[PDB]
């Protein structure tokens, strides 16, 4: 249809659109090529890329706090482990005495 509109059934004085001036000449080829519609798919998927960049950037920093909270937990756990062992030792020792 782009060719039908621009090339085939040309308008009377527009018959010389091959000799319309460069910028108008350019507005006319870009129509015929069916190129403007696939420029639109590119720019849509480019916005997909920019929004994807936004999501990862914020999630970047979370891992530091996550791993710090993860790593201190085992230290706390071994602390309670020695605590429980000492509790058992004291319970035995008092009755022994």
């Amino acid at each position: 249809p782009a060719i039908l509109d621009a090339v085939i059934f040309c308008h009377q004085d527009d018959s010389l659109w091959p000799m319309s001036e460069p910028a108008a000449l350019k507005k006319r080829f870009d129509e015929i090529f069916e190129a403007q519609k696939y420029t639109k798919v590119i720019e849509n998927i480019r916005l997909l890329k920019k929004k994807k960049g936004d999501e990862l950037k914020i999630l970047k920093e979370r891992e530091v706090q996550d791993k710090a909270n993860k790593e201190r937990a085992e230290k706390v756990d071994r602390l309670m482990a020695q605590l429980t062992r000492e509790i058992l030792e004291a319970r035995e020792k008092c009755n022994e005495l």
């Binding site: 010389l16 091959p18 000799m19 350019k26 090529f33 190129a35 420029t39 998927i45 890329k49 960049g53």
Partner: protein, 97 residues
């Protein structure tokens, strides 16, 4: 996800560019055949359509694809803007072909 959407657009972009160079080639062979066969004018040996594929400006992170078109007349090695002559016959003929 962010890098591969990027090579995804690189393939979409290289496809619209391969398409553009091949058609320039198709149009240039047919137009040369027609003009060289009809020697009525005797003033111009050949005419080409010079689509500027370097008109595309480089955006900070994007291709921003756009091709600038201007039709020229060739007399030997020299090529002229084809605009400003008074040979209305040449103008109409070139538009037609």
């Amino acid at each position: 996800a962010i890098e591969d959407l990027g090579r995804g657009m690189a393939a979409v972009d290289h496809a619209i560019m391969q398409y553009h160079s091949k058609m320039m080639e198709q149009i240039n062979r047919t137009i040369a055949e027609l003009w060289q066969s009809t020697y009525q004018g005797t003033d111009i040996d050949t005419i080409q359509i010079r689509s500027d594929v370097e008109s595309t400006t480089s955006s900070d992170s994007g291709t921003r694809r756009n091709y600038n078109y201007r039709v020229s007349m060739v007399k030997g090695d020299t090529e002229m803007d084809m605009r400003g002559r008074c040979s209305a016959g040449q103008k109409v003929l070139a538009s037609i072909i």
